[PDB]
Amino acid sequence: EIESLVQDSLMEMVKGVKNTIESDLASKKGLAQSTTEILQLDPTNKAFAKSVLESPNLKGSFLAIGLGYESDATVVENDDGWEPNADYDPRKRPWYVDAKRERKLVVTEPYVDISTKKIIISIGTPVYQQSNFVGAMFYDVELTQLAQLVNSVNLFDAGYLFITTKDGVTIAHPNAENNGEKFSQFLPNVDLKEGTQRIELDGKYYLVKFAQVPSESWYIGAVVDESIAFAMVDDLR
Amino acid sequence: EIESLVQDSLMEMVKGVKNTIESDLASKKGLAQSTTEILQLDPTNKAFAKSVLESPNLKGSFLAIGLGYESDATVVENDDGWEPNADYDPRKRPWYVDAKRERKLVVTEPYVDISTKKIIISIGTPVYQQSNFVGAMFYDVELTQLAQLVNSVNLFDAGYLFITTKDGVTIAHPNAENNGEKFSQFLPNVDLKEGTQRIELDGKYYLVKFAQVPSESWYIGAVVDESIAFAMVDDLR
Ligand SMILES: [Ca+2]
Ligand SMILES: [Ca+2]
């Protein structure tokens, strides 16, 4: 029947998007991990750190990158448009706090960047001198590229994709104003769970599919107007 | 028509794979370009280079990584199983020759790795000190991963995908023995060109589709048993 293949197809497409997001995240993390390990060869050498973070390919790979020191709360960073003032303590920032807590590569919750004032996420990493925790790094990620990427399938031209945290905070949405808000704001009475829920919103039936990204326990969400999907599939029929 | 939508979905599937291969290459190149740029901070410091190439994330991201020097023909490399004998000249090797000729990041033709003696390809990069060319690097890539990745769509269970150079040399094939051989050895009677060719091999009709990867001018190739693909679509009816 129409329904079985509509969900079969929706299934394959979401899984494809899931793999795309996982690969892109793996790419960013790999670059963050190696930069961090390379800096660990001499992490207190601020001149070394500065040259690395200003190297063009790496600089072009993130919104901004920086290194905060446990010992004096100073910061080495490559943001041309920002210089931390006296009150800025990197040790209170979420990328640093998370990286210190987990003692490994972390991806933060969405938060307000003090530099661009935009909602972003950062990859955070701990920095060690042998077994001494010396500080932490941020590698900031602009969320609109994620929203483009997560929309690399077409869902029978019957809907769109977005990304949420494991607690329902939007990570990427075609409409960036949603980033950092509960997804319930744009998608009322839907539970956050793996699989497919059929919903009614203002007189129409939609399909909401969630697939988790095991690396960060993000969910890929897809919303599909059931009628359009059935009609588009059926009119190949 | 059955054929119209078979061609349509086949097109969509190859598109997704092309983007998957591009992202993967992009990721490998980005890590290779950044490592190279970081080494250029002190390219003749072989202890620095050695420490970088041995750092665990980078080390685990490639088959092997090394840096060959123009002046003394020495090699710094992270391959546990291989140490350059007296006959070895990095300057005669394809990754080196190519990086030198183009003066930017390159991806070699398939060739026989001196270390593992397997067909591989390498990312090659040139190394500068100030303005002079100091040497080059290799970042070796195992081709069996690429074969897996290129086969991330199912083609209505009617065939398989592979990768060829712009001159028809196989880069990745489900059967590793084909790597580095012209593709006509497993796929005779077919021209290498963008688009779809319809051929007959041993009393049977197949669809051969090629999509080029603009980064490296590789082609993604897909071979499809049109009777299976037609019948599979007919089943969806
Ligand atoms: Ca700055
Ligand atoms: Ca060795």
Coordinates of C-alpha atoms and ligand atoms in Angstrom, one line a residue:
Chain A
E1 CA 0.0 0.0 0.0
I2 CA 0.8 3.7 -0.2
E3 CA 1.5 4.0 3.6
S4 CA 4.1 1.2 3.9
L5 CA 6.3 2.7 1.2
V6 CA 5.8 6.3 2.3
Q7 CA 7.3 5.3 5.7
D8 CA 9.9 3.0 4.1
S9 CA 11.0 5.9 1.9
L10 CA 10.9 8.4 4.8
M11 CA 12.9 5.9 6.8
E12 CA 15.7 5.6 4.2
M13 CA 15.9 9.3 3.7
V14 CA 16.1 10.2 7.4
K15 CA 18.8 7.5 7.9
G16 CA 20.7 9.1 5.0
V17 CA 20.5 12.5 6.7
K18 CA 21.5 10.9 10.0
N19 CA 24.7 9.5 8.4
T20 CA 25.4 12.9 6.7
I21 CA 25.2 14.7 10.1
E22 CA 27.3 12.1 11.8
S23 CA 30.0 12.3 9.2
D24 CA 30.0 16.1 9.3
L25 CA 30.3 16.1 13.1
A26 CA 33.0 13.4 12.9
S27 CA 34.9 15.7 10.6
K28 CA 34.7 18.7 12.9
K29 CA 35.6 16.6 16.0
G30 CA 38.6 15.0 14.2
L31 CA 39.9 18.4 13.4
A32 CA 39.3 19.6 16.9
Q33 CA 40.9 16.6 18.5
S34 CA 44.1 16.7 16.4
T35 CA 44.5 20.5 16.9
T36 CA 44.1 19.9 20.7
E37 CA 46.6 17.0 20.7
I38 CA 49.1 19.1 18.6
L39 CA 48.8 22.0 21.1
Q40 CA 49.4 19.6 23.9
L41 CA 52.9 19.3 22.7
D42 CA 53.5 22.6 24.4
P43 CA 50.2 24.0 25.6
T44 CA 51.4 26.9 27.8
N45 CA 53.3 28.4 24.8
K46 CA 50.9 31.1 23.9
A47 CA 52.8 32.1 20.7
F48 CA 52.7 28.5 19.4
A49 CA 48.9 28.4 20.2
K50 CA 48.4 31.7 18.4
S51 CA 50.1 30.6 15.2
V52 CA 48.2 27.3 15.1
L53 CA 44.8 28.9 15.7
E54 CA 45.6 31.5 13.0
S55 CA 46.7 28.9 10.4
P56 CA 44.3 29.5 7.5
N57 CA 42.7 26.1 6.9
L58 CA 41.9 25.6 10.5
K59 CA 40.8 29.2 10.9
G60 CA 38.4 28.7 7.9
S61 CA 37.0 25.6 9.5
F62 CA 35.1 27.1 12.4
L63 CA 33.4 30.3 13.4
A64 CA 36.2 30.9 16.0
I65 CA 38.7 28.9 17.9
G66 CA 40.3 29.7 21.3
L67 CA 42.3 28.3 24.2
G68 CA 41.6 29.4 27.8
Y69 CA 44.1 28.7 30.6
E70 CA 43.2 27.3 34.0
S71 CA 46.2 29.2 35.6
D72 CA 45.5 32.8 34.7
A73 CA 42.1 32.8 32.9
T74 CA 43.8 34.4 29.8
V75 CA 42.7 33.5 26.3
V76 CA 44.4 32.9 23.0
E77 CA 42.0 33.1 20.1
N78 CA 41.6 33.7 16.4
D79 CA 38.4 35.9 16.3
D80 CA 39.3 39.1 14.4
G81 CA 36.3 40.8 15.7
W82 CA 36.6 40.0 19.4
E83 CA 39.0 40.6 22.2
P84 CA 38.0 39.4 25.7
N85 CA 37.8 42.3 28.2
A86 CA 38.9 42.0 31.8
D87 CA 35.6 40.5 33.1
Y88 CA 35.7 37.6 30.6
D89 CA 36.6 34.4 32.5
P90 CA 36.8 31.4 30.0
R91 CA 36.6 29.1 33.0
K92 CA 33.0 30.0 33.5
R93 CA 32.0 29.5 29.9
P94 CA 30.0 26.3 28.9
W95 CA 32.6 24.9 26.5
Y96 CA 35.3 25.1 29.2
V97 CA 33.0 23.9 32.0
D98 CA 31.8 20.9 30.0
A99 CA 35.3 19.9 28.7
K100 CA 36.7 20.0 32.3
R101 CA 33.8 18.0 33.6
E102 CA 34.0 15.2 31.1
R103 CA 37.7 15.2 30.5
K104 CA 37.2 14.5 26.8
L105 CA 35.8 16.1 23.6
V106 CA 32.4 17.5 24.2
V107 CA 29.7 19.3 22.1
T108 CA 27.9 21.9 24.1
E109 CA 24.2 22.7 24.4
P110 CA 23.2 25.7 22.3
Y111 CA 24.2 29.0 24.0
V112 CA 24.7 32.7 23.3
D113 CA 28.2 33.4 21.9
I114 CA 29.7 36.4 23.6
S115 CA 31.4 37.3 20.3
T116 CA 28.6 37.3 17.7
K117 CA 25.8 37.3 20.2
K118 CA 24.3 34.5 18.1
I119 CA 23.0 31.2 19.3
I120 CA 25.8 28.6 18.5
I121 CA 27.3 25.4 19.7
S122 CA 31.0 24.7 20.3
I123 CA 33.1 21.7 20.3
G124 CA 35.0 21.8 23.6
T125 CA 38.2 20.0 24.5
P126 CA 40.3 19.6 27.5
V127 CA 44.0 20.5 27.4
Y128 CA 46.6 18.5 29.4
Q129 CA 50.2 18.9 30.2
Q130 CA 51.1 15.3 30.8
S131 CA 48.3 14.5 33.3
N132 CA 47.9 18.1 34.5
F133 CA 44.7 19.8 33.3
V134 CA 46.0 23.1 31.9
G135 CA 42.8 24.5 30.4
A136 CA 40.3 24.0 27.6
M137 CA 39.5 24.9 24.0
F138 CA 36.4 26.0 22.0
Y139 CA 35.8 25.5 18.4
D140 CA 32.6 27.3 17.6
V141 CA 30.1 26.1 15.1
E142 CA 27.6 28.3 13.2
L143 CA 24.3 26.5 13.3
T144 CA 22.8 27.6 9.9
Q145 CA 25.1 25.4 8.0
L146 CA 23.8 22.4 10.1
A147 CA 20.3 23.4 9.1
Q148 CA 21.1 23.4 5.4
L149 CA 22.9 20.1 5.8
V150 CA 20.1 18.4 7.7
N151 CA 17.8 19.5 4.8
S152 CA 19.7 17.5 2.1
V153 CA 16.7 15.3 1.4
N154 CA 13.4 16.4 0.0
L155 CA 10.8 14.3 1.7
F156 CA 8.6 14.2 -1.3
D157 CA 8.6 18.0 -1.2
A158 CA 6.2 17.4 1.7
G159 CA 8.2 18.8 4.6
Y160 CA 11.4 19.8 6.2
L161 CA 14.1 18.6 8.6
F162 CA 15.5 20.0 11.8
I163 CA 17.8 18.9 14.7
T164 CA 17.2 18.9 18.4
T165 CA 19.1 18.1 21.6
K166 CA 18.1 15.0 23.7
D167 CA 16.0 17.4 25.8
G168 CA 14.2 19.1 22.9
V169 CA 16.2 22.2 22.4
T170 CA 16.5 23.1 18.8
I171 CA 20.0 22.9 17.3
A172 CA 19.2 23.7 13.7
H173 CA 16.1 24.7 11.9
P174 CA 15.6 26.3 8.4
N175 CA 14.3 29.2 10.4
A176 CA 17.3 30.2 12.6
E177 CA 15.1 32.1 15.1
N178 CA 14.1 28.7 16.5
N179 CA 17.7 27.7 17.3
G180 CA 18.0 27.4 21.1
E181 CA 14.3 27.2 21.7
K182 CA 12.2 24.1 22.7
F183 CA 11.1 22.6 19.4
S184 CA 7.6 22.5 20.9
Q185 CA 7.4 26.2 20.0
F186 CA 7.2 25.4 16.3
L187 CA 5.9 21.8 16.7
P188 CA 3.2 21.5 19.4
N189 CA 2.0 18.3 21.1
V190 CA 4.7 16.0 19.8
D191 CA 6.8 13.8 22.1
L192 CA 10.6 13.5 21.6
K193 CA 11.0 9.9 20.8
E194 CA 12.7 7.6 18.2
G195 CA 10.3 6.6 15.4
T196 CA 7.2 8.1 13.8
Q197 CA 4.2 9.9 15.3
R198 CA 1.1 10.8 13.4
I199 CA -0.2 14.2 14.5
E200 CA -3.1 16.6 13.8
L201 CA -2.4 20.3 13.7
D202 CA -5.1 22.7 12.6
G203 CA -7.2 20.2 10.6
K204 CA -4.4 18.2 8.9
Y205 CA -2.4 15.1 9.5
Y206 CA 1.4 15.2 9.7
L207 CA 4.1 12.6 10.2
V208 CA 6.9 13.4 12.6
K209 CA 9.9 11.1 12.4
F210 CA 12.8 11.2 14.9
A211 CA 16.1 9.4 14.6
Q212 CA 18.9 9.8 17.1
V213 CA 22.5 10.7 16.4
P214 CA 24.2 8.3 18.9
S215 CA 27.4 10.4 19.0
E216 CA 25.8 13.3 20.7
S217 CA 22.3 11.9 21.3
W218 CA 20.9 14.7 19.1
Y219 CA 17.7 13.8 17.2
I220 CA 17.2 14.4 13.6
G221 CA 13.5 15.4 13.2
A222 CA 11.5 15.3 10.0
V223 CA 8.0 16.7 9.6
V224 CA 5.9 15.6 6.6
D225 CA 2.4 16.6 5.4
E226 CA 0.8 13.2 5.1
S227 CA -1.5 14.1 2.3
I228 CA 1.2 15.6 0.0
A229 CA 3.4 12.6 0.6
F230 CA 0.7 10.1 -0.2
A231 CA -0.4 12.1 -3.2
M232 CA 3.1 12.5 -4.6
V233 CA 3.9 8.8 -4.1
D234 CA 0.5 7.8 -5.5
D235 CA 0.7 9.8 -8.6
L236 CA 3.7 7.9 -9.9
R237 CA 1.2 5.0 -9.4
Chain B
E1 CA 6.8 5.2 -17.4
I2 CA 8.8 2.7 -15.4
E3 CA 12.1 3.8 -17.0
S4 CA 11.5 7.5 -16.3
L5 CA 11.2 7.0 -12.6
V6 CA 13.9 4.3 -12.5
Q7 CA 16.3 6.8 -14.1
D8 CA 15.0 9.6 -11.7
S9 CA 15.6 7.7 -8.5
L10 CA 18.9 6.2 -9.8
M11 CA 19.9 9.8 -10.4
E12 CA 18.9 10.8 -6.9
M13 CA 20.8 7.9 -5.4
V14 CA 24.0 8.6 -7.3
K15 CA 23.7 12.3 -6.3
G16 CA 23.6 11.4 -2.6
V17 CA 26.7 9.1 -3.0
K18 CA 28.6 11.8 -4.9
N19 CA 28.0 14.2 -2.0
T20 CA 29.0 11.5 0.6
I21 CA 32.3 10.9 -1.3
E22 CA 33.0 14.7 -1.6
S23 CA 32.4 15.2 2.1
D24 CA 34.7 12.4 3.0
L25 CA 37.4 13.6 0.7
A26 CA 36.9 17.2 2.1
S27 CA 37.3 15.8 5.6
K28 CA 40.6 14.0 4.8
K29 CA 41.9 17.0 2.9
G30 CA 41.1 19.4 5.6
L31 CA 43.0 17.4 8.2
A32 CA 45.9 17.0 5.8
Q33 CA 46.0 20.7 4.9
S34 CA 45.9 21.8 8.6
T35 CA 48.6 19.3 9.7
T36 CA 50.8 20.6 6.8
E37 CA 50.2 24.2 7.7
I38 CA 51.0 23.5 11.4
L39 CA 54.3 21.8 10.4
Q40 CA 55.2 24.8 8.3
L41 CA 55.6 26.7 11.5
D42 CA 58.8 24.8 11.9
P43 CA 59.1 22.5 8.9
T44 CA 62.8 21.5 9.4
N45 CA 62.3 20.6 13.0
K46 CA 62.0 16.9 12.6
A47 CA 61.3 16.3 16.3
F48 CA 58.3 18.6 16.0
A49 CA 57.1 16.8 12.8
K50 CA 57.6 13.3 14.4
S51 CA 55.6 14.3 17.5
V52 CA 52.8 15.7 15.3
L53 CA 52.6 12.6 13.0
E54 CA 52.5 10.3 16.1
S55 CA 49.7 12.2 17.8
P56 CA 46.9 9.7 18.2
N57 CA 43.9 11.2 16.4
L58 CA 45.8 12.1 13.3
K59 CA 47.7 8.8 13.3
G60 CA 44.3 6.9 13.4
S61 CA 42.9 9.0 10.6
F62 CA 45.1 7.7 7.8
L63 CA 46.9 4.5 6.8
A64 CA 50.2 6.3 7.4
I65 CA 51.6 9.8 7.3
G66 CA 55.1 11.1 6.5
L67 CA 57.2 14.0 5.4
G68 CA 60.1 13.7 2.9
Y69 CA 62.8 16.4 2.6
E70 CA 64.0 17.9 -0.6
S71 CA 67.6 18.6 0.6
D72 CA 68.7 15.3 2.3
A73 CA 66.0 12.9 1.1
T74 CA 65.2 11.8 4.6
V75 CA 61.8 10.7 5.8
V76 CA 59.8 11.4 9.0
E77 CA 56.8 9.0 9.2
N78 CA 54.5 7.3 11.7
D79 CA 54.3 3.8 10.2
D80 CA 55.0 1.2 12.9
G81 CA 55.6 -1.5 10.3
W82 CA 57.9 0.4 8.0
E83 CA 61.2 2.2 8.2
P84 CA 62.7 3.7 5.0
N85 CA 65.6 1.6 3.7
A86 CA 68.7 3.2 2.0
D87 CA 67.2 2.7 -1.5
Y88 CA 64.1 4.7 -0.7
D89 CA 63.9 8.2 -2.1
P90 CA 60.8 10.1 -1.1
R91 CA 61.5 12.6 -3.9
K92 CA 60.8 9.9 -6.6
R93 CA 57.4 8.9 -5.1
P94 CA 54.0 9.9 -6.7
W95 CA 52.7 11.9 -3.7
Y96 CA 55.9 13.8 -3.7
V97 CA 56.3 14.4 -7.4
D98 CA 52.7 15.5 -7.6
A99 CA 52.8 17.8 -4.6
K100 CA 55.9 19.4 -6.0
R101 CA 54.6 19.9 -9.5
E102 CA 51.3 21.4 -8.4
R103 CA 52.4 23.3 -5.3
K104 CA 49.2 22.5 -3.5
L105 CA 47.2 19.6 -1.9
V106 CA 46.9 16.7 -4.4
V107 CA 45.3 13.3 -4.5
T108 CA 47.5 10.8 -6.3
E109 CA 46.6 8.2 -8.9
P110 CA 46.3 4.7 -7.4
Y111 CA 49.8 3.2 -6.9
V112 CA 51.6 0.4 -5.1
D113 CA 52.4 1.5 -1.5
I114 CA 56.0 0.5 -0.7
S115 CA 55.0 -0.2 2.9
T116 CA 51.9 -2.5 2.7
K117 CA 52.5 -3.3 -1.0
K118 CA 48.7 -2.7 -1.5
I119 CA 47.1 -0.5 -4.1
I120 CA 46.3 2.8 -2.3
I121 CA 46.0 6.5 -3.0
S122 CA 47.6 9.4 -1.1
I123 CA 46.9 12.9 -0.3
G124 CA 50.2 14.8 -1.1
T125 CA 51.0 18.2 0.2
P126 CA 54.0 20.5 -0.4
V127 CA 55.9 21.9 2.5
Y128 CA 57.3 25.5 2.6
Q129 CA 59.8 27.3 4.8
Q130 CA 59.1 31.0 4.2
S131 CA 59.0 31.0 0.5
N132 CA 61.0 28.0 -0.5
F133 CA 59.8 24.4 -1.0
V134 CA 61.3 22.3 1.7
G135 CA 59.8 18.9 1.0
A136 CA 56.4 17.2 0.8
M137 CA 54.0 15.0 2.8
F138 CA 52.0 11.9 2.2
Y139 CA 48.7 10.9 3.9
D140 CA 47.9 7.4 2.7
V141 CA 44.3 6.3 2.2
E142 CA 43.1 2.7 2.3
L143 CA 40.8 2.2 -0.7
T144 CA 38.5 -0.5 0.9
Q145 CA 36.8 2.1 3.1
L146 CA 36.0 4.2 -0.1
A147 CA 34.4 1.1 -1.7
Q148 CA 32.2 0.7 1.4
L149 CA 31.3 4.4 1.4
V150 CA 30.4 4.5 -2.3
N151 CA 28.1 1.5 -1.7
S152 CA 25.9 3.4 0.8
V153 CA 22.9 3.2 -1.5
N154 CA 21.2 0.0 -2.6
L155 CA 20.2 0.7 -6.2
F156 CA 16.9 -1.4 -5.9
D157 CA 19.2 -4.3 -5.0
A158 CA 20.0 -4.4 -8.8
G159 CA 23.7 -3.7 -8.7
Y160 CA 26.6 -1.9 -7.1
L161 CA 28.8 1.3 -7.2
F162 CA 32.5 1.9 -7.7
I163 CA 34.9 4.8 -8.3
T164 CA 37.3 5.4 -11.2
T165 CA 39.9 8.1 -12.0
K166 CA 39.2 10.5 -14.9
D167 CA 41.2 8.1 -17.1
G168 CA 39.2 5.0 -16.1
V169 CA 41.6 3.6 -13.4
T170 CA 39.6 1.9 -10.7
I171 CA 39.9 3.7 -7.3
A172 CA 37.4 1.6 -5.3
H173 CA 35.4 -1.5 -6.1
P174 CA 33.5 -3.9 -3.9
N175 CA 36.1 -6.4 -5.1
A176 CA 39.5 -5.0 -4.0
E177 CA 41.4 -6.9 -6.7
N178 CA 40.0 -4.5 -9.3
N179 CA 41.6 -1.5 -7.6
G180 CA 44.2 0.1 -9.9
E181 CA 43.1 -1.8 -12.9
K182 CA 41.2 -0.1 -15.7
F183 CA 37.5 -0.5 -15.1
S184 CA 36.9 -2.2 -18.5
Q185 CA 38.4 -5.3 -17.0
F186 CA 35.2 -5.8 -15.0
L187 CA 33.0 -3.6 -17.2
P188 CA 33.7 -4.0 -20.9
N189 CA 32.0 -2.2 -23.8
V190 CA 31.5 1.1 -21.9
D191 CA 32.8 4.7 -22.4
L192 CA 33.7 6.8 -19.5
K193 CA 31.4 9.8 -19.7
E194 CA 28.9 11.7 -17.5
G195 CA 25.4 10.2 -17.7
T196 CA 23.8 6.9 -18.4
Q197 CA 24.8 4.2 -20.9
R198 CA 22.6 1.2 -21.8
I199 CA 24.7 -1.9 -22.5
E200 CA 24.4 -5.6 -23.0
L201 CA 26.9 -8.1 -21.4
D202 CA 26.3 -11.8 -21.8
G203 CA 22.7 -11.6 -23.1
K204 CA 21.5 -9.1 -20.4
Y205 CA 20.7 -5.4 -20.3
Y206 CA 22.4 -3.1 -17.8
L207 CA 22.4 0.6 -16.9
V208 CA 25.8 2.1 -16.3
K209 CA 25.7 5.6 -14.8
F210 CA 28.6 7.9 -14.1
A211 CA 28.6 11.1 -12.0
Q212 CA 31.9 13.1 -11.8
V213 CA 33.3 14.4 -8.5
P214 CA 34.5 17.9 -9.4
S215 CA 37.1 18.1 -6.5
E216 CA 39.3 15.4 -8.1
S217 CA 37.5 14.7 -11.3
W218 CA 36.9 11.1 -10.1
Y219 CA 33.8 9.4 -11.4
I220 CA 31.2 7.5 -9.3
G221 CA 30.1 4.6 -11.4
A222 CA 26.9 2.6 -10.8
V223 CA 26.0 -0.7 -12.5
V224 CA 22.3 -1.6 -12.5
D225 CA 20.5 -4.7 -13.8
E226 CA 17.7 -2.9 -15.6
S227 CA 15.3 -5.9 -15.5
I228 CA 15.8 -6.2 -11.7
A229 CA 15.4 -2.4 -11.3
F230 CA 12.3 -2.3 -13.6
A231 CA 10.8 -5.3 -11.8
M232 CA 11.6 -3.8 -8.4
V233 CA 9.8 -0.6 -9.3
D234 CA 6.9 -2.6 -10.8
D235 CA 6.6 -4.2 -7.4
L236 CA 6.2 -0.8 -5.8
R237 CA 3.1 -0.5 -8.0
Ligands
CA1 CA 40.7 38.4 18.8
CA2 CA 58.4 3.9 10.6

